[PDB]
Amino acid sequence: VAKLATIRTAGEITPIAGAEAIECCHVDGWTCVIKKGEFKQGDRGVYFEIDSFIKEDNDRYPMLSKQVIDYEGQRGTRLRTARLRGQLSQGLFLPMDRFPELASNQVGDDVTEILGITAWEPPISTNLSGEILGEFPTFISKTDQERVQNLIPQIEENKGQKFEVTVKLDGSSMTVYRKDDHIGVCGRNWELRETATNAQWHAARRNKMIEGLQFLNRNLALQGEIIGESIQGNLEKLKGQDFYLFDIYDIDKAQYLTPIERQSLVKQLNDNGFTVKHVPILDDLELNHTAEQILAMADGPSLNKNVKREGLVFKRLDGKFSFKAISNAYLEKHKDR
- Burial label for 334, CB within 10 Å (0-12, 13-18, 19+), is middle
Count other Cβ atoms within 10 Å, centred on residue 104: 6
Phi and psi angles of residue 143, each rounded to the nearest 5 degrees, phi first: -105, 15
Distance CA 77, CA 50 (A): 11
Farthest-apart Cα atoms in the chain, separation: 66
| Antiparallel, parallel or unpaired: β 30-35 and 22-27 | antiparallel
Helix (H) or strand (E) holding 204: helix 199-206
Nearest alpha-carbon partner for 310 in 202, 190, 172: 172
Q: Which residues pair with 175 in a beta bridge?
A: 186, 223
Name which of 208, 228, 209, 217 is nearest 180 in CA terms.
217
Q: Within 87-163, where are the H helices?
A: 152-156
Shortest CA distance to 60 belongs to which of 92, 83, 90?
A: 92
Contact criterion met (CB below 8 Å) for 89 and 83: yes
Cα separations in angstroms, 185 against 23, 213, 232? 49, 12, 20
Count of CA atoms in the C-beta half-sphere (13 A) of 78: 16
Closest CA to 144 of 293, 244, 247, 241: 247
Query: Could you tell me which residues come within 8 angstroms of residue 303 by beta carbon, excluding any fewer than 6 positions away?
Result: 167, 169, 227, 236, 244, 279, 280, 309
Helix (H) or strand (E) holding 233: none
Method: X-ray
Strands 285-286 and 277-278: unpaired
CA distances from 231 to 54, 129, 242, 280 (A): 27, 11, 10, 18
Residue type, 271: D
220 to 50, 166, 212: CA distances (angstroms): 33, 21, 11
Q: What does DSSP assign to residue 132? A: E
- CA distance between the termini of the chain: 19
Strand-strand pairing, 241-250 and 277-278: parallel
Q: What is the DSSP letter of 293?
A: H
Identify the DSSP state of 304: S
